[PDB]
Amino acid sequence: MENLNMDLLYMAAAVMMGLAAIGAAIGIGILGGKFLEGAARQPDLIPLLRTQFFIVMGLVDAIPMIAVGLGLYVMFAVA
């Protein structure tokens, strides 16, 4: 079951990352456009632009980063 939970996990990361990438991309762009629009609309939120970019992408990508991260953290590192 090691080779299965090994390949299945890695492979799961691919699917998970992709599916999560799609959904993540969709939402990031969703809230990203609106938030980015306002902030980018207000000259005083220029730093918000970048800050929000990383925050929205990171918070959304934190999910697969956490799943994949935890997986490989113990798998590739601890296994």
Swiss-Prot record:
Keyword entries, A-Z: ATP synthesis, Cell inner membrane, Cell membrane, CF(0), Formylation, Hydrogen ion transport, Ion transport, Lipid-binding, Membrane, Transmembrane, Transmembrane helix, Transport
Top-rank taxon, per record: Bacteria
Keyword Transmembrane helix found: yes
CDD domains: ATP-synt_Fo_c_ATPE
Cytoplasmic side: 32-52
Location within or outside the cell: Cell inner membrane
Main location: membrane
Site (Reversibly protonated during proton transport): D61
Ranges that cross the membrane: 11-31, 53-73
Result when mutating L31F: In uncE408 and uncE463; unable to assemble in the membrane
Gene Ontology, cellular component aspect: plasma membrane; proton-transporting ATP synthase complex; proton-transporting two-sector ATPase complex, proton-transporting domain
Entry-linked HAMAP family: ATP_synth_c_bact
Function field: F(1)F(0) ATP synthase produces ATP from ADP in the presence of a proton or sodium gradient. F-type ATPases consist of two structural domains, F(1) containing the extramembraneous catalytic core and F(0) containing the membrane proton channel, linked together by a central stalk and a peripheral stalk. During catalysis, ATP synthesis in the catalytic domain of F(1) is coupled via a rotary mechanism of the central stalk subunits to proton translocation.
Extra information: Dicyclohexylcarbodiimide (DCDD) binding to the reversibly protonated aspartate residue inhibits ATPase in vitro. In this organism c-rings of between c(8) and c(12) can be isolated in vivo following experimental manipulations, however only c(8) and c(9), in addition to c(10), are partially functional.
Subunit structure comment from the entry: F-type ATPases have 2 components, F(1) - the catalytic core - and F(0) - the membrane proton channel. F(1) has five subunits: alpha(3), beta(3), gamma(1), delta(1), epsilon(1). F(0) has three main subunits: a(1), b(2) and c(10). The alpha and beta chains form an alternating ring which encloses part of the gamma chain. F(1) is attached to F(0) by a central stalk formed by the gamma and epsilon chains, while a peripheral stalk is formed by the delta and b chains.
Name of the protein in its database record: ATP synthase subunit c
Source organism of this protein record: Escherichia coli (strain K12)
